[PDB]
Specification:
The chain contains 18 helices and 24 strands. The chain is of the alpha+beta class. The chain has one domain. The strands form 5 sheets. Strands 10, 11, 12, 13, 14, 15, 16, 17 and 18 form a 9-stranded antiparallel beta sheet that branches. It has a 5-stranded parallel beta sheet with strand order 6-3-7-8-9. It is globular, with a radius of gyration of 25 Å. The N and C termini lie far apart (53 Å). The structure holds (2,4-dichlorophenoxy)acetic acid (2 copies). One (2,4-dichlorophenoxy)acetic acid binds next to β3, β7 and β8. One (2,4-dichlorophenoxy)acetic acid binds next to α7 and β10. Its EC number is 6.3.2.-. Keywords: ATP-binding, Ligase, Nucleotide-binding. GO terms for molecular function: ATP binding; glutamine binding; ligase activity. This is Indole-3-acetic acid-amido synthetase GH3.15.
């Protein structure tokens, strides 16, 4: 647990963060003893430990598990069995996660104490942000987030996202500009995005930070602005909400900010939105914002160049490393280069072990710099030695606390037969290849992929949506550069792929298909119409569903094949 502290006392908060990252071994051992002692009579723990609370019996007798191994406990609680199947405290909500098992979202128990500890630690960490980001304390955080539905279990437990649970709790015991639909559901995402942007624009002079779950989340906001800014501004000029907004939360709530006709504010926003280039639009619309906070690591690293284009120099920050299962780390250097983000594990948030990636698990303090690990977390909400499914690389120490860079999920995205191409390798390959377009004033906006086993020999298909700065005439890549892009992806894949191409002969030439602009919004709307969470949506890096494939296939303009065979010993 975390000690009592004054969140208004910035020096006391920073001094506590130093303590927390210095006494790492002692805090970890304290956390473990507390979890094992308090949960000793749960059905889950007693079956393995029979009352022991010492670390060595823990390591010997408690198995390392995945969500698949423990799902039955969660389902039984969802059906009405008591929280003490897994936890000595009541389960207050189930969290719907991104990442599945299988093929639905994981449902993760959360206790009220765990939730308040996470909120507590967030207020412990904000003074560091304020110390690093001048002016951040001077205004509000405009957070682009909304929820379109929620549910409850058979026994009546609420099912929510972690963000909603986080916001709802700090709201119930208090600086944030958050949409009326971050907590209260609205099925119409058009109404919810409209009201949230209207509020954000009305409050633009009070906004010190922009936030969203992911880097790509901002592109959906910007796309909506491109289509609807004149109507938004018209509402600001007249002080009158457009009458097609029927959602009761927006219509009853909007009067708080839409207080009177404001022609001058409307004209200011129109002046920015009517410019040809939307470069720096985010800073121009929110000129007092001090940073843009979202996940920019892993798959989201792909959107950094485009988000920086819209950012006008606002630093892109990624402050937090966490999951439904556990809040895990923070960035002690929030203004670092987005490519240099590392997260320091916070020892009081759980007991953290690490599985070497390449059966061998080490304690947090025994991690090896430069080696890859999957976190194995033991928590205060009924998870014990639970595999989180991320791969982190240990990069150093903040005081005595290891810090890690996010490598990726552990996920095969493409496989013709014995080739198993992982998401992190495909991402690095596409990163290498898309660089070749920079001399031609072209940018890769998004991509996905599929295995084409139709014919003779199977091969990878990568779908590329391209854009540029010229809105005046057609843009198009020459075939020579596209063909070298194909090769550069291939040369970046692993030895099994490359041996397949050069030696084995069972893998054919990689293919890049350029899709028309808007292809990846059509793809997204396809998944949304089938129940995907809007706020948790990420472009999947490969697609198998036949209706999504048919969507990508009829957006295809040009196709290109690698003309060179990749190298391999
Ligand atoms: O750790 C995480 O996964 C994200 O946590 C948060 C941090 C800050 C704010 Cl404002 C909201 C949330 Cl959900
Ligand atoms: O921006 C902020 O205020 C804190 O970070 C977040 C807040 C809300 C959401 Cl959804 C995602 C992120 Cl990364």
């Amino acid at each position: 647990m975390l000690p009592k502290f004054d969140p208004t006392n910035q020096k006391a908060c920073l001094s506590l963060l130093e303590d927390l990252t210095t006494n790492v071994k002692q805090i970890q051992d304290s956390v473990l003893e507390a979890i094992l002692s308090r949960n000793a009579q749960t059905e889950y723990l007693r079956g393995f430990l029979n009352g022991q609370v010492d670390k060595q019996n823990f390591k010997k007798n408690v198995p390392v598990v995945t969500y698949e191994d423990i799902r039955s406990y969660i389902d039984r609680i969802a059906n009405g069995e008591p929280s003490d199947l897994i936890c000595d405290r009541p389960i207050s909500v189930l969290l719907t996660s991104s990442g599945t098992s299988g093929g639905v979202p994981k449902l993760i128990p959360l206790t009220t104490e765990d939730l308040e500890q996470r909120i507590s630690f967030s207020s412990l960490y904000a003074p560091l942000l304020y110390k690093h980001i001048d002016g951040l304390s001077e205004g509000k955080s405009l957070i682009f987030y909304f929820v379109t539905r929620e549910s409850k279990t058979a026994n009546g437990l609420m099912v929510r996202t972690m963000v909603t649970s986080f916001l709802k709790s700090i709201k119930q015991t208090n600086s944030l500009q958050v949409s009326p639909h971050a907590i209260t559901t609205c099925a119409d995402t058009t109404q919810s995005m409209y009201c949230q942007l209207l509020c954000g624009l009305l409050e633009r002079d009070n906004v010190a930070r922009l936030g969203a779950p992911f880097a790509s989340s901002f592109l959906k906001v910007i796309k909506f602005l491109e289509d609807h800014w004149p109507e938004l501004c018209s509402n600001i000029r007249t002080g009158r909400l457009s009458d097609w907004i029927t959602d009761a939360t927006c219509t009853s709530g909007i009067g708080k900010f839409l207080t009177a006709p404001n022609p001058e504010l409307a004209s200011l926003i129109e002046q920015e939105c009517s410019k040809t280039s939307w470069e720096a639009i985010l800073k121009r619309l929110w000129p007092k914002a001090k940073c843009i906070e979202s996940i920019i690591t892993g798959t989201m690293a792909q959107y950094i160049p485009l988000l920086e284009f819209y950012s006008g120099g606002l630093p892109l920050t990624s402050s937090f490393y966490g999951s439904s299962e556990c809040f895990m780390g923070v960035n002690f250097n929030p203004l670092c280069k987005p490519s240099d983000v590392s997260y320091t594990i916070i020892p009081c948030m759980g007991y953290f072990e690490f599985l070497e990636v390449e059966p061998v698990v080490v304690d947090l303090v025994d991690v090896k710099i430069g080696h890859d690990y999957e976190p194995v977390v033991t928590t205060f909400s009924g998870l014990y030695r639970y595999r989180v499914g991320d791969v982190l690389r240990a990069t150093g120490f903040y005081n005595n606390a290891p810090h890690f860079c996010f490598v990726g999920r552990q996920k095969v995205v493409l496989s013709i037969d014995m080739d198993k191409t992982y998401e992190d390798d495909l991402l690095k390959a596409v990163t290498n290849a898309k660089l070749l377009l920079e001399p031609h004033d072209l940018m890769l906006m998004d991509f996905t992929s599929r295995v084409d086993s139709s014919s003779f020999p199977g091969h990878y298909v990568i779908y590329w949506e391209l854009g540029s700065k010229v809105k005046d005439a057609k843009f198009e890549p020459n075939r020579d550069v596209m063909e070298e892009c194909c090769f550069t992806v291939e040369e970046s894949l692993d030895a099994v792929y490359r041996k397949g191409r050069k030696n084995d002969k069972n893998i054919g030439p990689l293919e890049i298909k350029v899709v028309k602009p808007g292809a990846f919004d059509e793809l997204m709307n396809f998944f949304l119409s089938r129940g995907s969470s809007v706020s948790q949506y990420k472009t999947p890096r490969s697609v198998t569903n036949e209706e999504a494939l048919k969507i990508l296939e009829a957006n295809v303009i040009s196709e290109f094949l690698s003309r060179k065979i990749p190298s391999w010993e």
